[PDB]
Write a protein that binds this ligand. Structure first.
Ligand SMILES: *P(=O)(O)OCC(C)(C)[C@@H](O)C(=O)NCCC(=O)NCCS[C@H](CS(=O)(=O)NC[C@H]1O[C@@H](n2cnc3c(N)ncnc32)[C@H](O)[C@@H]1O)c1ccccc1O
Ligand SMILES: *P(=O)(O)OCC(C)(C)[C@@H](O)C(=O)NCCC(=O)NCCS[C@H](CS(=O)(=O)NC[C@H]1O[C@@H](n2cnc3c(N)ncnc32)[C@H](O)[C@@H]1O)c1ccccc1O
Lengths: 606, 611
């Protein structure tokens, strides 16, 4: 029925024979516990039993059937980190419908994009979301995508109230999930491409993803999991994420964001033993502790998952040191292929590598530029196929052609290298995609918006280092009439895109490399940047800038003044000597101190 | 004979009977090796055998005897980290003369001070030192201390050349060291007082200090020691320091300063296995490694001594981690009493404690304010007597009265606490003394110089925190006509004092606490400051322009926002925002991330902080 790329007959056989595809519905995850009175979800003050959760799902599905939603249809769901998300998810699974779980941070243009490829018969959104405070964008939206028939809204005492359908009990309704080898729902790809590109996941492949993730991370009835990153992403969903907790009878604790202020209290209060984060939030947490939060509220936490973005060995090491729990690096994509470091792994592999695939039948090779297998120390493009990795994007034949080699191996656009032990390390990136706090940003998607501006001739979006976010977006523009970053960010916001897509820096420049096709050449530009970057002071005035912080803030010296009289201490001086010796190697401590004036030291750095 | 406070007869007996005092001259350290051809000292490109070192000393001593220096007299020596220091020391020991080894950093006022108490018959200095470049200060100096008869200078091509006397061989010459229980030389306390106070050390007590230090640190002929901190201080001299290396037949490698740039090459080139540092140099070294120095030049180094100043457990732990050798904390004073952590000690004790005394007969207690002993966990003033700890300062009866209780126990002015295991931890300080990179600075000595200035009415010197130096001097003044730090540092410099005594910060204030006696009660001064400062640590933006100052660095440098603009349009990212919310919640506890971001303008956030 729904049109996805299937697996070669031969693979569908090996995957069932090898036990990976159990041909069970994803609903079976919540169904197992249908009779349990233990707590599945804690959202704020509310707590739901598995019985209640599964019941709510039956109700909402029943109520939706009554509103004339037929199996085979698609939906568009935008819900935040709130229980109604998990309810809606299972309700839609029980009906036979395939939703797209949209990020709550998404906006006008993203939602439009999704609804156009999906042709949704159902819309579920939240009135606390800016687009849904009023019914105007709402009304405009339903008319523009005509397929939409039913609409339910969270936080609405009004007509379309979602809670009404959730609490209206069940009829002669029985579940009708789609077949195990038929599409279950759609996941969102981390953008490489301007038109948003969806990922179909069948009950079979997705369920394996979750089961095997539970085995590896040791989730059990005991697991109390804090889900503070966006709940709708594949990571906090399947890896093992909240669904993995549900399969195992554990407890999911939802939180609106991952702020130490919000989370710390919840981890102690609910005795949380595991949680998943992205590197920027780990930085935030470690610092919040140093800034006087009590390392003791976090004492119940025995496991910290970190993934979605490059995690430095420096930062990884700080986790068990300052927080005092075990680290597991998770490297996965919405398309398939999650790599974990194991819990019984050595501290060497856990701090330095990204681990290895969750499946023995996950195939990974390292590829060179023409497409050739490299040995195992060598760096190249990551290729993989497998039992939970998909065979192509939904209704996107154009892109599918470039994303898969002739053998069905997907390419993530990641540069990796493999250990002699078989562990993967993320070396770099062969894609134009920016990874910002672990939110993917498609460079071309944003360039195309920039080109909608009258004064923009050529546009290029590249990543750039940030100690905290880990990467930030920087837009390089060639302009008719000069443009200021504010105006760009403002212009783009008016285009109705997610707030984190707005560039963190904008640099107008005299020219940009153009390739035969008309787009800026990213390889090039990336080179004539990273070169300029890789350093000791330029102007005598640049040397003053370096010295001043080392003296008494109280006064400023004349270039010929003795800097000791200004409070510069011999140790800071020795260091300055060391830093400058790496350029003029005759400079030592003694030489600097023999005549310590700015004049003297400038004559030396000449 | 020279006038020092002796040990009670009962103790001199126990200390000989227990083997501590061997009644041998300190020269015996160099004498043992007089026939050895192995290398005692490497100074730059020069290398001296024990035979040569001992010989040079016999020559310089003989040459000095010829110039009329009689046993019993005193000297003033100012020499840096160079071999001629060690030669001069033993030369003067062989004559029977007791020198003061002055720091090379010392200047006009310090040297005057020393020569006044000592009444030196002999002056030995270096022409590379600013005061001795020319003959100007030297002439003024000898007239103004008339006791001085002979003068020898390092790097003097002229008549006073020291090298000449060092190389002029020995006539009929025998050493006439002073008797083991008589004074050998003088050491400098950093001093708690404004007149410099000298510490007499007898051959007996000082030699013990060295022997027992060698045993504990296991120096042997294999020990190859880099002496980069000032060579004349008790630490790099006796603990075990260069003399400990000489006793053991090891090799001492001299270096002018302890910079990673100078030292790293020397440790590799000479295969140095041990060296002593102060906490600020350890920071400098650890960072130099991170900044791209190869951890491999330091590979021969099996032991790193760190002392002289508080060494944080964070820093201590980094040593074996990043440098990869063993740490030994050393907490001694020039007056006696060195505490080591042992080499076989646990990593717990080595990182957290300062170790315990090098002698079983070292006595340590702790005292509340009455002088009564505190129980075996409590914090209080450190009291000690012992076989190598002196019984009083040289010709300073006034101070001696306050530095010793009636039982002969010296008080270091340190606040310590003792482990159930008996290990000492330095808790804090009483003495009004500033410890700057581990150079002691007497607060009163500097105050009295500040009062020499016309515009200064009341003066107070206190310590202050510094991440790197560990402590810096800050001078609080009450002034007639307003003074700027530069003018103070310059004024003080002209007073002829060591460069590190110049205050790192100067604050002019409207008033200072004065006690019934007339000088700043530094005790209130210390609290008025305690609070002003700990009120501003949890401090949050004062006013709306102070809040702008905090936000701007978080946005694009490119533009500035109007108070009502949305700050996200200016590049402020949700993570930094969460953090700002956290810091502000500690004052208004209703503030979370969500609230900040609902309306992220400077106006909005100001309305929230004025509540
Ligand atoms: P403000 O904006 O309010 O807040 C900032 C903050 C807190 C960071 C906020 O943005 C936030 O909450 N962020 C969370 C980000 C997040 O939830 N990320 C989940 C990503 S879902 C991911 C699949 S993917 O396709 O989107 N990513 C695939 C690509 O990601 C790269 N990548 C993944 N893991 C990596 C590791 N470990 N190292 C290096 N790169 C990594 C890679 O390039 C890949 O192609 C996902 C993550 C984990 C497991 C499974 C999946 O599917
Ligand atoms: P620029 O100025 O060119 O360079 C800066 C730099 C490198 C810091 C420079 O000044 C420098 O080289 N400094 C080295 C200082 C130094 O050599 N110090 C040795 C001093 S001799 C010391 C005994 S004392 O009487 O001088 N001081 C005694 C007091 O010291 C405190 N204290 C000692 N040890 C301590 C430890 N381990 N922890 C905490 N406090 C400590 C205490 O207040 C005591 O009363 C000495 C030190 C070690 C061993 C033996 C002796 O004699």
């Amino acid at each position: 029925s729904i049109p996805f790329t299937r697996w070669p007959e031969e693979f569908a056989r090996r995957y069932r024979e090898k036990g990976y595809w159990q041909d069970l519905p994803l609903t079976d995850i919540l169904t197992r516990h249908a009779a349990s009175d233990s707590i599945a979800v804690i959202d704020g003050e509310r707590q739901l039993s598995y019985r209640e959760l599964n019941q709510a799902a039956d109700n909402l599905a029943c109520s939706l059937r009554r509103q004339g939603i037929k199996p085979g249809e698609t939906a568009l769901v935008q819900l935040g980190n709130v229980a109604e998300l998990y309810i809606t998810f299972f309700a839609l699974l029980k009906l036979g419908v395939a939703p797209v779980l949209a990020l709550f941070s998404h906006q006008r243009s993203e939602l439009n994009a999704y609804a156009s490829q999906i042709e949704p018969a159902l819309l579920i959104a939240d009135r606390q979301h800016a687009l849904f405070s009023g019914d105007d964008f709402l009304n405009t939206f339903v008319t523009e995508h005509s397929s939409i028939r039913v609409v339910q809204l969270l936080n609405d005492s009004g007509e379309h109230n979602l809670q009404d359908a959730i609490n209206h009990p069940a009829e002669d309704f029985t579940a009708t999930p789609s077949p195990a080898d038929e599409v279950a729902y759609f996941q969102l790809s981390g953008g490489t491409t301007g038109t948003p590109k969806l990922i179909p996941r069948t009950h079979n492949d997705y369920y394996y993803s979750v089961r095997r993730s539970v085995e590896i991370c040791q989730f059990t009835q005991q697991t109390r999991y804090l889900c503070a990153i966006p709940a709708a992403h594949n990571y906090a969903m399947s890896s093992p994420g909240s669904l993995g907790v549900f399969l195992a009878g554990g407890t999911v604790v939802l939180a609106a964001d991952p702020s130490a202020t919000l989370c710390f209290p919840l981890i102690e209060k609910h005795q949380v033993n595991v949680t998943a984060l992205v590197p920027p939030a780990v930085s935030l947490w470690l610092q919040a502790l140093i800034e006087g939060e009590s390392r003791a509220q976090l004492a119940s936490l025995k496991l910290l998952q970190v993934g979605g973005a490059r995690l430095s060995a420096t930062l990884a090491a700080r986790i068990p040191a300052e927080i005092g729990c075990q680290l597991q690096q998770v490297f996965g994509m919405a398309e398939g292929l999650v790599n974990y470091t194991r819990l019984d792994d050595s501290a060497e592999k856990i701090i330095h590598t990204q681990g290895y695939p969750m499946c023995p039948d996950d195939e990974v090779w390292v590829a060179d530029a023409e497409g050739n297998p490299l040995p195992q120390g060598e760096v190249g493009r990551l290729m993989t196929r497998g039992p939970y990795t998909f065979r192509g994007y939904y209704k996107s034949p154009q892109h599918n052609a470039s994303a898969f080699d002739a053998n069905g191996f997907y390419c993530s656009g990641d540069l990796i290298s493999i250990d002699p032990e078989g562990y993967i390390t993320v070396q770099g990136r062969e894609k134009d995609q920016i990874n910002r706090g672990g939110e993917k940003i498609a460079a071309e998607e944003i360039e195309n918006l920039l080109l909608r501006h009258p004064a923009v001739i050529y546009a290029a979006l590249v990543s750039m280092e940030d100690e905290l976010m880990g990467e930030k977006s920087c837009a390089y523009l060639v302009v008719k009439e000069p443009l200021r970053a504010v105006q760009v960010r403002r212009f783009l916001r008016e285009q109705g895109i997610a707030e984190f897509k707005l560039p963190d820096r904008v640099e107008c420049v005299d020219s940009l490399p153009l390739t035969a096709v008309g787009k800026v050449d990213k390889k090039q530009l990336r080179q004539w940047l990273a070169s300029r970057a890789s350093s000791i002071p330029a102007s005598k005035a640049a040397l003053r800038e370096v010295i001043l912080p080392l003296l008494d803030e109280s006064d400023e010296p004349f270039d010929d003044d003795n800097l000791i009289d200004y409070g510069l201490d011999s140790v800071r001086m020795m260091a300055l000597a060391a830093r400058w010796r790496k350029v003029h190697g005759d400079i030592d401590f003694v030489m600097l101190a023999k005549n310590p004036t700015i004049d003297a030291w400038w004559k030396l750095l000449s």
